[PDB]
Amino acid sequence: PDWNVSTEQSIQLTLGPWYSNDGKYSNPTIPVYTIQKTRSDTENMVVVVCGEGYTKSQQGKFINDVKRLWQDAMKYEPYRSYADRFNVYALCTASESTFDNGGSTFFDVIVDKYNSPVISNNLHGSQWKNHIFERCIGPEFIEKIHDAHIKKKCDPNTIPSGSEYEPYYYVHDYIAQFAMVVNTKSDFGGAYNNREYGFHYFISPSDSYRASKTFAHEFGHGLLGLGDEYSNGYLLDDKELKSLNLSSVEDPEKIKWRQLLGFRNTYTCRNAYGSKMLVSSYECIMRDTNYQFCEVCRLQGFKRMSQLVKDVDLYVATPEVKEYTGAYSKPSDFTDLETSSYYNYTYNRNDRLLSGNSKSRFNTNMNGKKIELRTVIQNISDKNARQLKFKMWIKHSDGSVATDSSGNPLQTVQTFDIPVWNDKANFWPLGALDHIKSDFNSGLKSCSLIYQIPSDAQLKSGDTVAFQVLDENGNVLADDNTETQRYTTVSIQYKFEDGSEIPNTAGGTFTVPYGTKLDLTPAKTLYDYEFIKVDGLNKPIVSDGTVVTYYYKN
Ligand SMILES: [Zn+2]
């Protein structure tokens, strides 16, 4: 057949018998499409997506499939908070046969007896097939396309058996993640993280009934470093320190995530009846693909991604307001690790919740009652300690601050000190091959502000709890409208100054909070084109389908 995509930007590989023993892909041409390039590759996390089982005439489907899956992944926190700090490239790897036809494919993917997708070295006797990403595709991409333009060092068809891993370690520092999308409807998924031996890729299907959730799940194993919360077993020591989101420590005073206990749906429990593997929440995507990321996974994932960029200095989880009753306020309240205790906890939280979609639960019977504003804040600086001010007040329906019988406003303020992240260098820094141990509480502070509503509070129907989390300059980092905020879709398009579209680009779509002013320094180049101007930055995004246009010369 013929390519149904532009060939103007491409890379060429040389695959000898170790990577293509049958010769079917000895000298393949791989067209390169830019799904998103908001900044220089040196400042963003670079994601490279290749297609398995797409013929030359199916590359239009492959690009659209990558855009769909990537956009749906960017709707999950913590990815969403970094959506504009990814650069995404689609590499149109052509297979002779479609996957469903079962002939020759670019990556020799088979589905084993465990429904796992695996690059099969022994399918055609290509003994280094599953090293293709870090030894062939990666170095060619980093030399020709990546703004760093690192010249290839070692010949991938010549390197002798012995120290064949170290010369390719740099690949996974310039390319944050390799993703392989299989043109199929079968439901499978698998991540392969073993950087000491060069593996950092995952495989997911394009059209399964849960393709988008599977993509976000395997991306969390690969990029975020999260473990499966469905796994059995028993984390002994060393394994306890290694795991970001799993634990086997049963004393709530010693659990790594003690500071998060009682915050939203964080209640330690076993991942199954009679299991010694504990999770911080029974509703997380890393256990069941129908859920969102739990608070620990969001914290850990956010921290991991902060290592790969240089301009993120603080994590502020979405605060919550609850009636303070003393329930679930001390570590002893969390000693029961059964799933019954978790769901009883979530029911207690819902009964006391006064924020988000439960902001309406506030009523005039709240007089003389205590309310608690709570969130979790992670400092990203290993250098600068932070001080954040929490303000909370009772607000009437019309926006006025409620008062007591003396006319004193029902408001309270408390400043919290966020310590530095001293242990930062131990938490998947750029260049690490693995994670061994980290201090979960380094740079971490649970902040709780308890306010006693006076008994003489002049409450009216429709009153609500308002709050603000402010930084040292007074910027609002989160408020009582954050949880239910509307998000608007924004697209980045790439055009020449005359107005035509730049070939081999296909701008994707991500969401930002309504009213967001995008503040990004565009990359100086796009392929060999030089950046001129951008239309759409530094203005409030107030409509779905807003287009920001990057303009390039020639
Ligand atoms: Zn989780």
Author numbering: 323 to 876
Paper text:
Here, we investigate the substrate specificities of two enzymes of the M64 metallopeptidase family, the IgA protease ThomasA from Thomasclavelia ramosa and BF3526 from Bacteroides fragilis. In contrast, X-ray crystal structures of BF3526 in complex with substrate and product peptides, combined with enzymology assays, show that this enzyme targets the N-terminus of pre-digested proteins, but does not act on intact IgA. These findings reveal divergent substrate recognition strategies between M64 family members, while providing new structural insights into their conserved catalytic mechanism. Despite containing a metalloprotease domain with a putative zinc-binding motif, ThomasA shares little sequence homology with M26 proteases. This multidomain protein (~130 kDa) harbors a zinc-binding HEXXHXXXGXXD motif within its predicted catalytic domain, a hallmark of zinc-dependent metalloproteinases. Structural comparison of ThomasA323-878 and BF3526-STPP crystal structures revealed a conserved overall architecture of the M64 peptidase domain.
ThomasA323-878 comprises three distinct domains arranged from the N- to the C-terminus: an M64 peptidase domain (residues 323–632) and two β-sandwich domains (β1 domain: residues 633–807; β2 domain: residues 808–878). Although the crystals were grown in the presence of the decapeptide VPCPVPSTPP, which corresponds to a segment of the IgA1 HR, no density for the peptide was observed in the active site of the structure. The M64 peptidase domain adopts a seven-stranded β−sheet topology (β1–β2–β4–β3–β7–β9–β8), with β2 and β8 in an antiparallel arrangement. The active site, which extends longitudinally across the enzyme, is a large, solvent-accessible cavity flanked by β8, α3, loop 2, connecting loop α3–α4 (loop 4, residues 545–616) from the M64 domain and by a small segment of connecting loop β13–β14 (loop 7, residues 741–764) from the β1 domain. However, we did not observe electron density for the predicted catalytic Zn2+ that should be coordinated with two histidine residues (H539 and H543) from α3, along with D550 from a long connecting loop 4. A secondary Zn2+ binding site is located within the M64 peptidase domain, where it adopts a tetragonal coordination with E551 of loop 4 and three cysteine residues (C606, C616, C619) from loop 4 and α4. This secondary site is less solvent-exposed, suggesting a structural rather than a catalytic role. The β1 and β2 domains encapsulate the M64 peptidase domain on the side opposite the active site, burying 4714 and 2026 Å2 of the interface, respectively according to PISA analysis. The X-ray crystal structure of ThomasA323-878 reveals that β1 and β2 domains are positioned opposite to the active site, suggesting a structural role rather than direct involvement in substrate recognition or catalysis.
